[PDB]
């Protein structure tokens, strides 16, 4: 059961989409995405995980909200790579899988940079939430 | 198994430890180091590579050359980030594993930088090589 490092600050709540993971391979990424990423929604199998960020409309004091970003995956397709930015929230993430790369869920990638290699293919991830993703850990097929 | 990008450029001849990783874990690391990384050779188990760069003495005419950095991983040590500064060649290489944080190899740290991080450990690496380390690829354990 190999993870990355969590990557952000300590605010929000936390999640874990391990139990979740059981329903089998990731099928889908939904994000909402403007300068930077405010929420992340899997789906394991057929089941979607909960809206991890974008707690409540009234967020819109401390960011902007941003467009809704989906990416159905193939079968066979895994998630086997990540560029973060991060630092106090998650600012960015750029996926990329065996099939292709996918564009960055925030357009501002001015805070610390990491590329998260995701060994087997992304499981499932586990993090912090509120009004945006205050930061996310990658649990590897491995 | 999942890999990084290749870092670095195309001059050199391939090298891949990928056969050799075979033989275990990455149980040590030497590098030779001056303003830049000029060769790297792992250890996997206990079955050493080549010395992948510094391909003979006079490669000074085309950089320094530099000292023999040894580091012994313990059991249980595994390399989980590396920051490479690259362009032409690699430039630097700093290693962490879950137990310490390495010196960097290579005083020069100029060049583009990324750092990779790679969970459950580094598995092998592969590049190339001649006088000095022209490129290096990360990969993971699955
Ligand atoms: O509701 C008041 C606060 O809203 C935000 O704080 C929530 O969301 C943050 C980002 O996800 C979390 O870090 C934090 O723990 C949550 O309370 C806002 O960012 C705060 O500044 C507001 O005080
Ligand atoms: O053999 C003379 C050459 O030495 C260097 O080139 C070798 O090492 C380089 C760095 O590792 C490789 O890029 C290259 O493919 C090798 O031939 C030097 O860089 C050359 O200028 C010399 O001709």
Redesign the interface.
Known sequence: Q????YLGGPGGDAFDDKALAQNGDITRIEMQCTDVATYIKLRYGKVDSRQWGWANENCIQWSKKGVKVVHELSSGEYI??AIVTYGKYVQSITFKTNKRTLPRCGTSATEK?????????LKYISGRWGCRIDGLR?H???
């Not at 190999?2 to 490092?5: Q, Y």
């Not at 940079?113 to 293919?121: A, D, E, H, Y």
């Open positions: 190999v993870a990355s490092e086997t790579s940079s990491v590329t998260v290699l995701i060994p087997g293919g990658f590897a097929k491995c």
